[PDB]
């Protein structure tokens, strides 16, 4: 038992979070601080592996591990809870006069800050998308990883290379040679930018999944969304360079957003 | 008991706040050279003193001593540097008292109310005019002594007051905070509020009010008292929002 271990009686377990939307994840209360928390429970090696990964990740714009319960079953991974839930549904339901262009810019900047951190620490996300981000009060955004390919139904994830892929977020080299890297995260980030700019539309709208790889390899790219600033679209296109090594680093992306934000 | 002190331990100065609080005066607790507030004057007075000996919380006005042997009687509390919350909202600089501070103030009040809920006390007059402000936007709930606009439906129709009617009033207090101290139900004839509430009219979201704050307002204004959240739930939602807003505020400063 290490410094992250917490007594199970420190947490009030309330109910499954989102009625099963996230699997075996419960809304709870960290009683001594009056804080709502999220608690992932084991219905085993992968579970503890996820916990060990999260002990190494500490950044304002990444989901923060608060504690674990590993003394007897069921095992717990406890994180902060984010008031407004996932970013995709938030964008689709928000007041767009309230969540306006400067807020969208602010959300993109925080996500690039989180990815710059993972880049610095040699992590790969592998499933970056709006559905894996969370929104808090005062336009806080945190990047998470809910393990959604198992949980979500529909066409978002589809069978490919004997696995489940979000085809429309997946970099070419990952689709073709099953190669994943920080640069394939940059590609997905470009798609996430487009999700943000369209307030959560599905990417390549109206284009069948069967066409996506061929179109990309023949240099098709999504058009600039209505109202999207040209400089932001330039960034999207740099994220979608066919050669991973031609894509910018997250350090460069965040610097560019930083400059843009203070000029607003 | 420990609370009894002599009337001569305290130098009584002029009445406080133009008497708007009644017979409450600025005083000085001599032994500590400390400015204090002193309420002076049936046995309601002594009931209030007895209650305040049972209350201790960061965001509830702190009793310091009592004089309950021979008239005139004293209830002595700490003195709060910045006066009552309603005037503070109405006169403040909104660039300094911004959305992060308004959230901090609501969080502090919900914590005081969770504490009263846990002790089985009922406030019965929660409103911004009954809160006090100290340094660093510290807020404490007090009770100075119907306000139809703050009064829950079952209190209006049946004279039933409970912690859940305090929850209703807290929702109205949130709206006071969110509007920097506007009067609730703008322009609406107070004599028609009960029937309006019965037919599911509620105040609209104020300009700039966060959506989860308004959702909590509307939960506080559920018609059935059992459908309203507890103050433990409300306080938990606000501490959770407040931590998010503090992190974001730091991220935004770091960008500049
Ligand atoms: C309760 C929990 C347990 C574990 C996690 N894990 C992560 O979010 C996560 C994030 C990043 C990594 C980093 N990782 C390294 C590289 N690899 C390839 C994958 C990514 C790992 C796990 C989140 C949570 N939190 C969680 N889960 C589901 C829903 C919610 C939730 C929902 C609504 C509102 N607030 C919170 N919150
Ligand atoms: C000097 C005093 C005497 C008594 C009280 N009493 C209370 O503030 C109080 C608060 C809560 C309860 C709890 N009670 C539970 C039961 N229900 C029905 C009523 C509430 C009782 C009294 C406050 C004060 N303090 C007070 N009163 C008026 C003005 C000021 C004041 C004004 C400006 C600056 N600094 C201080 N300060
Ligand atoms: N309705 C509608 C569509 C619309 O107005 N789209 C917009 N998108 C933005 C925007 C600004 C900065 C970033 Cl970083 C991003 Cl991703 C998007 C500005 S307006
Ligand atoms: N124009 C105008 C006034 C205005 O901007 N009003 C606002 N209210 C909020 C707010 C934030 C947190 C809480 Cl808890 C509450 Cl009650 C309100 C933020 S901005």
CA of A179 to nearest chain B CA: how many angstroms apart?
Answer: 33
Output the 3-class SS for A57-117: CCCCCECCEEEEECCCCCCEEEEECCCCCEHHHHHHHCCCCCCCHHHHHHHHHHHHHHHHH
Kindly provide the b/e burial profile for residues B64-76, where b requires at least 16 CB atoms within 10 angstroms of the residue's own CB. bbbbbeeeebbbb
Which of the listed CATH numbers 3.50.50.60, 1.10.3720.10, 1.10.510.10, 3.40.50.620 matches domain A82-263?
Answer: 1.10.510.10
Residue of B nearest to A107 (CA): B248
CA of A167 to the centre of ligand 3 (A): 24
Beta bridge partners of B24: B39
Judge if B1-79 and B80-244 fold alike in CATH terms.
Answer: no
Question: What experimental approach yielded this model?
Answer: X-ray
Query: DSSP state, B60?
Result: B
Query: Is any ligand 3 atom within 6 A of the Cβ of residue A235?
Result: no
Smallest CA-to-CA distance from B1 within B54, B44, B42 is with: B54
Between CA B131 and CA B87 the distance in angstroms is 10
Burial (0-12, 13-18, 19+ Cβ within 10 Å), A44: exposed
Residue of A nearest to B208 (CA): A98
Whether domain A1-81 has CATH 3.30.200.20: the reply is yes
Kindly list the domain boundaries of chain A, sorted by start residue: 1-81, 82-263
Query: Is any ligand 4 atom within 6 A of the Cβ of residue B181?
Result: no
Query: Is any ligand 4 atom within 6 A of the Cβ of residue B101?
Result: no
How many Cα atoms occupy the beta-carbon half-sphere of A149 within 13 Å? 15
Per CB-CB distance under 8 Å, the chain A contacts of B207 are none
Kindly provide the b/e burial profile for residues A141-174, where b requires at least 16 CB atoms within 10 angstroms of the residue's own CB. bbbbbbbbeeebeeebbeebeeeebbbbbbbbbb
Burial (0-12, 13-18, 19+ Cβ within 10 Å), B195: exposed
Can you name the CATH fold of B80-244? Transferase(Phosphotransferase); domain 1 (1.10.510)
Between CA A77 and CA A17 the distance in angstroms is 14
- Look-up: residue for tokens 């939307």? A21
Smallest CA-to-CA distance from A140 within B211, B244, B218 is with: B244
The angstrom resolution of this structure is 2.2
- Look-up: residue for tokens 């209030």? B48
The interaxial angle of helices B99-118 and B163-178, nearest 10 deg, is 170
Beta bridge partners of B35: B28
CA-nearest residue for atom 8, ligand 4, is: B178
Between CA B146 and CA A123 the distance in angstroms is 61
Question: How much of chain B is in helix, strand and coil states, percent to nearest 5?
Answer: 50, 15, 35
The residue to mutate among A107, A222, A230, A232, having the most atoms of ligand 3 within 8 angstroms of its beta carbon, is A232
Residue of B nearest to A97 (CA): B208
Q: Give the tokens for residue A261.
A: 């934000």
CB-nearest partner of A138 from B99, B232, B240: B99
A190 has binding-site annotation: no
Separation of first and last alpha carbons in chain A:
48
A83 has binding-site annotation: yes
Q: Give the tokens for residue A249.
A: 């680093």
Question: Under CATH, to which class is B1-79 assigned?
Answer: alpha beta
Q: Which atom of ligand 2 is nearest to the CA of B55?
A: 13
Omega of the bond prior to A74 within 30 degrees of 0, cis? yes
Between CA B168 and CA B229 the distance in angstroms is 10
The Cα-based distances of A22 to A38, A184, A196, B236 in angstroms read 11, 25, 22, 22
CA of B252 to nearest chain A CA: how many angstroms apart?
Answer: 8
């Amino acid at each position: 038992y290490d410094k992250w271990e917490m007594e199970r009686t420190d947490i009030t377990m309330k109910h499954k979070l989102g009625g099963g939307q996230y699997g075996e994840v419960y809304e709870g209360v960290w009683k001594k601080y009056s804080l709502t928390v999220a608690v992932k429970t084991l219905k085993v090696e992968e579970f503890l592996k996820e916990a060990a990964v999260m002990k190494e990740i500490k950044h304002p714009n990444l989901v923060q591990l608060l504690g674990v319960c590993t003394r007897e079953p069921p095992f717990y991974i406890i994180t902060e809870f984010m008031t407004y839930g996932n970013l995709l549904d938030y964008l689709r339901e928000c007041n767009r006069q309230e969540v306006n262009a400067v807020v969208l810019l602010y959300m993109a900047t925080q996500i690039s800050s989180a990815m710059e951190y993972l880049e610095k620490k040699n992590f790969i996300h592998r499933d970056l998308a709006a559905r894996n981000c969370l929104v808090g009060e005062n336009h806080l955004v945190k990047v998470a990883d809910f393990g959604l390919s198992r949980l979500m139904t529909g066409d978002t994830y589809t069978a490919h290379a004997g696995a489940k892929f979000p085809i429309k977020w997946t970099a070419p080299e990952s689709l073709a040679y099953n190669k994943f890297s920080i640069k394939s995260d940059v590609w997905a980030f470009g798609v996430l930018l487009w999700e943000i700019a369209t307030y959560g539309m599905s990417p390549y709208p109206g284009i069948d999944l069967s066409q996506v790889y061929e179109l990309l390899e023949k240099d098709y790219r999504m058009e600039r969304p209505e109202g999207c600033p040209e400089k932001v679209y330039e960034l999207m296109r740099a994220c979608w360079q066919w050669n991973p090594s031609d894509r910018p680093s997250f350090a460069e992306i965040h610097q560019a957003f930083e400059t843009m934000f203070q000029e607003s």
